[PDB]
């Protein structure tokens, strides 16, 4: 069969 | 508001009680809750000394409240960040990831988080500033559980965003956060997780050295974790490694990764894990034949088959592939398995789904099945195709003579080839 590939900010205040 | 003028004048101040009062009420400032006066802070014109007091090695506790006040400010909007990144704080930032006090180390760990978090852009300038290795070399044995957190939550930032950073910038990572997705502790799992997840999303090569980090029994391990928060990405990374080449998914198929995916199809779990789990199974049974035989002996068929006839469309779509894979790789008799659970009508029903995509791999399957019955046939000297009667029966062979009138022409032809093949 055939092998398929997987079909912004992140922060944080303190 | 009324104590502005003597809070800028605190900060520019240079006597140090007053520059620790006036930067120490900045960082309450910064802290609340929601919409923190971010912009108002950077337009009283405090950021550039907030950053010379970082320097300040003889008032680690000005240096550590200066660096609270950075760090939320650069948890703001991209400018707000840019803002930091401009008044030369990243280099700053990545020094005192080697100061004497552990408050400081742990507000720098996370000023270059909120840095890096911005965008692959100022990720990528926290990296060629050499924020990774003193990142690492203050972990250790001994690392306090804040820390650990913090430094996971970074690493993650480090790692995470499209376009991938370059291999070589993160590889070093790839030991601690092994390391790391040992702890039982919910946030540095999640964080390790997902930066693994990042770093295993790509060709072989990045595979490989993810794999030979040795992490592969406990990522299957934390496909149980009762946690959605770790769950989610363990199992996008397990997903991201059996993408790779077949000895790369038996390092996954061989810490009994097909049973825990299965319960994640039978327990009631969220939609979008059971696709998951279904695409990863996919992978797998694009696999060679002991590898479909390990879907079959975990007794993933059975519910796949039930999956891609009653699920959800986006989860029918991830078990069509799957079945329609286990029969274009299995042996004859695998194929025969499949059909004795029952795969045909499913297949068969899908033939009408507006997803051309789907309706090919269905008929691909149908097609790997009807070949199997017809060597059933040869080998009995027989009068019919067991197979094809049974596609007859799921009212499989009118959808496949109506896709004669499909415009895809691959389908099409792909329609008459079979219905000249096995009903002529």
């Given at each position: 069969?055939?092998?398929?590939?997987?079909?912004?900010?992140?922060?944080?205040?303190? | 508001?009324?104590?502005?003028?003597?809070?800028?004048?605190?900060?520019?101040?240079?006597?140090?009680?007053?520059?620790?009062?006036?930067?120490?009420?900045?960082?309450?400032?910064?802290?609340?809750?929601?919409?923190?006066?971010?912009?108002?802070?950077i337009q009283s014109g405090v950021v550039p000394r907030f950053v010379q007091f970082l320097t300040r090695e003889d008032f680690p506790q000005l240096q550590f409240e200066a660096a609270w006040a950075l760090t939320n400010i650069a948890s703001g909007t991209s400018e707000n960040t840019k803002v930091v990144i401009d008044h030369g704080a990243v280099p700053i930032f990545v020094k005192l990831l080697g100061s004497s006090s552990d408050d400081v180390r742990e507000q720098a760990v996370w000023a270059?988080?909120?840095?890096?978090?911005?965008?692959?852009?100022?990720?990528?300038?926290?990296?060629?500033?050499?924020?990774?290795?003193?990142?690492?070399?203050?972990?250790?044995?001994?690392?306090?559980?804040?820390?650990?957190?913090?430094?996971?939550?970074?690493?993650?930032?480090?790692?995470?965003?499209?376009?991938?950073?370059?291999?070589?910038?993160?590889?070093?990572?790839?030991?601690?956060?092994?390391?790391?997705?040992?702890?039982?502790?919910?946030?540095?799992?999640?964080?390790?997780?997902?930066?693994?997840?990042?770093?295993?999303?790509?060709?072989?090569?990045?595979?490989?050295?993810?794999?030979?980090?040795?992490?592969?029994?406990?990522?299957?391990?934390?496909?149980?974790?009762?946690?959605?928060?770790?769950?989610?990405?363990?199992?996008?990374?397990?997903?991201?490694?059996?993408?790779?080449?077949?000895?790369?998914?038996?390092?996954?198929?061989?810490?009994?990764?097909?049973?825990?995916?299965?319960?994640?199809?039978?327990?009631?779990?969220?939609?979008?894990?059971?696709?998951?789990?279904?695409?990863?199974?996919?992978?797998?049974?694009?696999?060679?034949?002991?590898?479909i035989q390990a879907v079959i002996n975990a007794g993933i068929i059975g519910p796949l088959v039930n999956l891609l006839q009653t699920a959800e469309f986006d989860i029918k779509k991830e078990a069509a592939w799957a079945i329609s894979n286990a029969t274009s790789g299995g042996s004859?008799?695998?194929?025969?398995?499949?059909?004795?659970?029952?795969?045909?009508?499913?297949?068969?029903?899908?033939?009408?789904?507006?997803?051309?995509?789907?309706?090919?791999?269905?008929?691909?399957?149908?097609?790997?099945?009807?070949?199997?019955?017809?060597?059933?046939?040869?080998?009995?000297?027989?009068?019919?195709?067991?197979?094809?009667?049974?596609?007859?029966?799921?009212?499989?062979?009118?959808?496949?003579?109506?896709?004669?009138?499909?415009?895809?022409?691959?389908?099409?032809?792909?329609?008459?080839?079979?219905?000249?093949?096995?009903?002529?």
């Amino acid at each position: 069969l055939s092998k398929r590939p997987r079909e912004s900010e992140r922060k944080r205040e303190r | 508001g009324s104590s502005l003028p003597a809070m800028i004048g605190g900060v520019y101040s240079d006597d140090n009680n007053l520059q620790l009062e006036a930067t120490t009420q900045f960082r309450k400032l910064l802290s609340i809750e929601r919409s923190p006066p971010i912009e108002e802070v950077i337009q009283s014109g405090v950021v550039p000394r907030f950053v010379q007091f970082l320097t300040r090695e003889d008032f680690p506790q000005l240096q550590f409240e200066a660096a609270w006040a950075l760090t939320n400010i650069a948890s703001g909007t991209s400018e707000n960040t840019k803002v930091v990144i401009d008044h030369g704080a990243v280099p700053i930032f990545v020094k005192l990831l080697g100061s004497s006090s552990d408050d400081v180390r742990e507000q720098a760990v996370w000023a270059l988080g909120n840095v890096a978090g911005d965008s692959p852009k100022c990720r990528d300038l926290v990296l060629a500033n050499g924020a990774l290795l003193p990142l690492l070399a203050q972990l250790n044995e001994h690392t306090k559980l804040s820390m650990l957190r913090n430094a996971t939550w970074t690493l993650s930032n480090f790692c995470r965003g499209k376009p991938q950073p370059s291999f070589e910038q993160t590889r070093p990572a790839l030991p601690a956060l092994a390391r790391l997705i040992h702890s039982n502790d919910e946030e540095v799992l999640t964080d390790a997780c997902w930066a693994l997840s990042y770093l295993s999303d790509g060709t072989n090569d990045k595979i490989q050295a993810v794999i030979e980090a040795g992490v592969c029994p406990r990522l299957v391990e934390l496909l149980l974790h009762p946690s959605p928060s770790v769950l989610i990405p363990a199992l996008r990374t397990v997903g991201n490694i059996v993408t790779g080449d077949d000895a790369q998914t038996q390092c996954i198929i061989d810490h009994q990764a097909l049973p825990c995916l299965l319960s994640l199809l039978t327990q009631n779990l969220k939609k979008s894990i059971k696709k998951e789990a279904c695409w990863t199974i996919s992978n797998i049974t694009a696999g060679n034949k002991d590898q479909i035989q390990a879907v079959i002996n975990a007794g993933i068929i059975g519910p796949l088959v039930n999956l891609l006839q009653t699920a959800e469309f986006d989860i029918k779509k991830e078990a069509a592939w799957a079945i329609s894979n286990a029969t274009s790789g299995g042996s004859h008799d695998q194929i025969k398995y499949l059909v004795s659970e029952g795969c045909i009508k499913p297949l068969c029903d899908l033939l009408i789904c507006p997803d051309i995509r789907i309706v090919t791999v269905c008929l691909e399957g149908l097609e790997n099945i009807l070949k199997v019955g017809e060597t059933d046939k040869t080998l009995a000297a027989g009068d019919v195709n067991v197979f094809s009667q049974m596609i007859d029966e799921a009212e499989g062979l009118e959808k496949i003579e109506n896709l004669q009138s499909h415009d895809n022409n691959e389908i099409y032809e792909k329609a008459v080839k079979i219905l000249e093949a096995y009903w002529m």
